Amino acid sequence: ELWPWMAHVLLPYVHGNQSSPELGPPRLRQVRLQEALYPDPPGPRVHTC
Amino acid sequence: YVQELGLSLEESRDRLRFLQLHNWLDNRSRAVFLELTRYSPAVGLHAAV
Amino acid sequence: SVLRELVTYLLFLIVLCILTYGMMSSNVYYYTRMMSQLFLDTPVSKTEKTNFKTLSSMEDFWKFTEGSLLDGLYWKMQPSNQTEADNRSFIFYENLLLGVPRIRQLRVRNGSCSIPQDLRDEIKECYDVYSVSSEDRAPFGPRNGTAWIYTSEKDLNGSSHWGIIATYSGAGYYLDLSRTREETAAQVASLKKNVWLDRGTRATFIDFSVYNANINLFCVVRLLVEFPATGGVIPSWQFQPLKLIRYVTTFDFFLAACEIIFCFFIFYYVVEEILEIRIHKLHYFRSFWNCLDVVIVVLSVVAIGINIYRTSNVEVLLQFLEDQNTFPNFEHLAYWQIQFNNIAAVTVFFVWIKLFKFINFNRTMSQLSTTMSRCAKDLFGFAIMFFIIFLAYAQLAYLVFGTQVDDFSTFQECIFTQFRIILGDINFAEIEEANRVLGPIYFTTFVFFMFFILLNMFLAIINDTYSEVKSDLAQQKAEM
Amino acid sequence: SVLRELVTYLLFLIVLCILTYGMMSSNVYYYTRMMSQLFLDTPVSKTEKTNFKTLSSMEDFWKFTEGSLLDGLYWKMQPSNQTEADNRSFIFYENLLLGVPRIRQLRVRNGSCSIPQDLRDEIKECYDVYSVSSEDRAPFGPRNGTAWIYTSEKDLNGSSHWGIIATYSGAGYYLDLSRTREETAAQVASLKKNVWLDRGTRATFIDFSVYNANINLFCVVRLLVEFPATGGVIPSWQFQPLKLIRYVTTFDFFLAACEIIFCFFIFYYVVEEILEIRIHKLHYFRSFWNCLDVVIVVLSVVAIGINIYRTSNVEVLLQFLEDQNTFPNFEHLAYWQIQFNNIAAVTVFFVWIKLFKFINFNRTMSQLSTTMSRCAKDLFGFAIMFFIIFLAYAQLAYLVFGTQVDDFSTFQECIFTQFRIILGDINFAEIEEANRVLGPIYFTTFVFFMFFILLNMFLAIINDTYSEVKSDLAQQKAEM
Numbered sequence A: 001e002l003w004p005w006m007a008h009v010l011l012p013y014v015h016g017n018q019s020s021p022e023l024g025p026p027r028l029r030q031v032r033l034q035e036a037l038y039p040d041p042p043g044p045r046v047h048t049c
Numbered sequence B: 001y002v003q004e005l006g007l008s009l010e011e012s013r014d015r016l017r018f019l020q021l022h023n024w025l026d027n028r029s030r031a032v033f034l035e036l037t038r039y040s041p042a043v044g045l046h047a048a049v
Numbered sequence C, D: 001s002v003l004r005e006l007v008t009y010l011l012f013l014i015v016l017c018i019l020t021y022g023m024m025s026s027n028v029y030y031y032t033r034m035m036s037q038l039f040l041d042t043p044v045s046k047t048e049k050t051n052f053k054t055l056s057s058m059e060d061f062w063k064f065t066e067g068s069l070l071d072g073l074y075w076k077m078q079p080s081n082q083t084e085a086d087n088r089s090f091i092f093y094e095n096l097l098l099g100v101p102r103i104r105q106l107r108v109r110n111g112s113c114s115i116p117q118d119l120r121d122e123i124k125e126c127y128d129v130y131s132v133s134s135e136d137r138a139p140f141g142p143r144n145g146t147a148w149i150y151t152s153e154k155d156l157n158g159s160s161h162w163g164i165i166a167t168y169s170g171a172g173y174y175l176d177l178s179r180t181r182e183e184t185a186a187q188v189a190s191l192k193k194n195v196w197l198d199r200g201t202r203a204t205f206i207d208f209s210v211y212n213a214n215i216n217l218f219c220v221v222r223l224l225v226e227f228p229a230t231g232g233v234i235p236s237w238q239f240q241p242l243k244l245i246r247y248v249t250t251f252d253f254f255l256a257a258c259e260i261i262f263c264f265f266i267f268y269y270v271v272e273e274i275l276e277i278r279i280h281k282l283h284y285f286r287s288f289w290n291c292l293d294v295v296i297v298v299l300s301v302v303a304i305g306i307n308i309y310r311t312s313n314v315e316v317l318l319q320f321l322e323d324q325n326t327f328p329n330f331e332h333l334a335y336w337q338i339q340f341n342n343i344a345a346v347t348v349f350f351v352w353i354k355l356f357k358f359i360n361f362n363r364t365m366s367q368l369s370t371t372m373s374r375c376a377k378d379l380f381g382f383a384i385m386f387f388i389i390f391l392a393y394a395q396l397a398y399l400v401f402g403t404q405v406d407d408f409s410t411f412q413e414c415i416f417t418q419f420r421i422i423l424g425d426i427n428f429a430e431i432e433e434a435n436r437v438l439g440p441i442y443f444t445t446f447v448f449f450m451f452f453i454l455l456n457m458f459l460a461i462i463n464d465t466y467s468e469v470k471s472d473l474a475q476q477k478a479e480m
């Protein structure tokens, strides 16, 4: 769901048409951790990480 | 892992299509960390977002 | 002589109560409620979920204007007659629309601010915050009519407003709409087509008024939308139900007679006060029952003066009744009505406090007054420290949480929030999600210190002196 | 000895408690809640979300009459859903009708108010607020039947209602509906065609009753819709269950014996009071328990008289259960049932309070009672001042926020809002926006003064009294 949000409200906001003084293009730095995440097994919906 | 969102609203769309074309956000990542700055000259204030 | 003054004070109380009984008429809250529900609650569109109270962008304002606004203004013509030409609109089949609504805006000048030279390439346009010294006074766009030409404050017969962000002047670029929906909509569409609300606009006002001939009570409606320099939209509104045709019924004659009696009472009170001060007790101020008297007299004189000023200056209604196809300017009357209401409210509040002078009849009521009088000095002495610590906490909260919480955005708001915390009317959420450290610390320390130490100290101060007074009186009675 | 009077009082309390538990019954609340959900929550039509609780226009009221009303009044027990081999928990309202419902309207006449001559060229119709002297008593429209002809209160067996705005009389233009849906709908459509709710209408009542055929309790339903003179719609409802069939099993025959025992107890108390008032200490009203048994006796006499009246009027209901060609007038029965319930609740409360006289045996309870009785004059004396300040603040709030808050709309509403503020149940979102100045000042000064000074003084009075009583009772012992 991040991509529709970025395409709808982010990109028209950063570029715009004579609006939104930006002062530097945005960035999308991400961390990898190089390990496949295990999906949460069903249960009481634990609130841990 | 940084990724710049182009310079204008003509290549940023292609950059996105690349990013979800080659599973940039696979099932290993942890965060996306979208970050940008803003400037308001009327009040002369910057804003880190 | 504890009886000549008691009777004339009960008479004053009766006159004042009669005066405020007709001033605060019934079936008036419902009128304002219906108007507010009609205008501030109807969604801007059938497919939209936003109303005037939750406007979020300049595009939403255009949707509201040519939309939920015209629906509530120009109601149906209830066709049962000839309908010769452009029949008038009754808002609820009972509320007549007087004259024609007016819209206007206040904007700023392109060359207002001064952007730094470091990045003077990517920044081309800039508009400073609203101020009189930074206002646009030149034609813009299609300089054709009165919506694209500046017109001074003296020419609009306007005045300041004191909105939320700043105090807006009475001038600006205005336009008077039409009496029918099919023409007002065309005018608004023409305004929207060639851009009227640019990025340099700072405020927008919409004004009109209604009559409701059933119960003779005018109502002036004003809606303001503020565009701050940092972006966004701030809405505000007011609905003032004022009256201008008082003497229509016998009850109004009774109210006028009561007002005359009140004026005579005030004259008698000021004469007796000046007679007392002229010869007896040239100091006169060490009693706490004479400062109240002068406060009451001053407030009543101010109220009478305001009432005379706003009752003699009703020529706007006479001017409007000549040509009924023009905007009726009824803002000064509403402002003065609000001021008079405030003055009357505070005067009525202080009279009941003055009533305390006479409840000393029996012995069991003398000791309570004695205790209060004896402990007032110490209560003030400790209240000084209480307020100092309270203001220190308020300023700390304002400086720390004042940019993210929306409950500490202003010093006054900080004070109100800290009074509400004592009530147990706080959520404990925005403080902690504002800052996980120094967030709960402030709350815990404030609650502990304030509640325990200061509330118990007030209790101790009152209890000790009450017990001392009671014991002294008991000993004196038993030894005599 | 006091043991015999203790036994008699406990027997009386047991009789009263068992009688109240018997008359309270059960599952009446569920019946009332199902009635409310059926007649109030369902939308008027599948294309709209406006139920009866949220009426806002005359057309909505007209839509309700053919919509939620009929769809829910004529055998809405349809088990077309997934019922488990029987009627489910929700569907238990077969609800056979007791004859025909009645509709009635109250309206005023054109010219009840005089418009000013300045606007007289612009306005022609003036309809005043509802009043007995301004009511319309003339035929209108197709003057053919009872729906277009005024009928006096005597000819209609009506009574006052005391609605939300005003108190409506029992006269008006009335129509008796029919038994079957497809003809009642036709009658209502004919009423809607020839306009029946003009601009002069001020109130509309709908009345009917049901039996439910399986739990043995009638239900009287009244629905009021009143249109203020300022435009709008105000709805209200009244559902009252009744149980006058009180001889079915052996359980309810025991209540007759309980009533006989209660009557004997009341007679014994009356004769005891009248014998003790005369010979022993004529005008003995100095004490508290002496002035408390009179209240209990009077309230019980009123309750038994009301019950006798209800029993006498029971016969007016039973004679027509197989007849469904006349409107059943059950309003008086419901009103007197409510009165009886209120009287019974109050007298039970006072009987329970009377128990405090007997638990004064040991030193602890006697000391507590002595402390409680000693701090009675002081508490009343200080409560006088507390309520003087409370009423001053309430009047100030009424004058300031009386038109645009809805918590200070009326004086009693101001008092209750202040009492809730003491509990910290304030909104403060509307108080600040109603008046940016003089609004927060009210809140801050009220909270500070009220809590600190007045609560500390109330605590101090009781604390000092308790200390003095304990010291006195300690000194009087071990000193003789």
Ligand SMILES: *[C@@H]1O[C@H](CO)[C@@H](O)[C@H](O)[C@H]1NC(C)=O
Binding pocket: C110, C111, C124, C125, C126
């Ligand atoms: C506003 O002024 C700047 C320079 O001060 C100029 O570049 C820009 O074109 C102006 N905009 C308008 C609409 O006049």
Ligand SMILES: *[C@@H]1O[C@H](CO)[C@@H](O)[C@H](O)[C@H]1NC(C)=O
Binding pocket: C142, C144, C145, C190
């Ligand atoms: C501008 O004024 C002319 C005057 O002849 C008028 O014809 C035209 O419609 C106007 N244009 C507007 C108001 O947009």
Ligand SMILES: *[C@@H]1O[C@H](CO)[C@@H](O)[C@H](O)[C@H]1NC(C)=O
Binding pocket: C155, C156, C157
């Ligand atoms: C302002 O006051 C003048 C003076 O009477 C009046 O002629 C005019 O119509 C008023 N309104 C405007 C918009 O000028």
Ligand SMILES: *[C@@H]1O[C@H](CO)[C@@H](O)[C@H](O)[C@H]1NC(C)=O
Binding pocket: D110, D111, D124, D125, D126
């Ligand atoms: C109401 O009464 C006034 C009094 O003359 C009359 O002029 C007007 O036509 C009446 N209106 C209706 C609808 O009867």
Ligand SMILES: *[C@@H]1O[C@H](CO)[C@@H](O)[C@H](O)[C@H]1NC(C)=O
Binding pocket: D142, D144, D145
């Ligand atoms: C009025 O007269 C009777 C009611 O007494 C009714 O049957 C008839 O249809 C009515 N006439 C009109 C025109 O509604």
Ligand SMILES: *[C@@H]1O[C@H](CO)[C@@H](O)[C@H](O)[C@H]1NC(C)=O
Binding pocket: D155, D156, D157, D327
């Ligand atoms: C009012 O009561 C009398 C009593 O006999 C009855 O005849 C009459 O029908 C009642 N009124 C109505 C409208 O039913």
Ligand SMILES: [Ca+2]
Binding pocket: D289, D290, D293
């Ligand atoms: Ca007794």
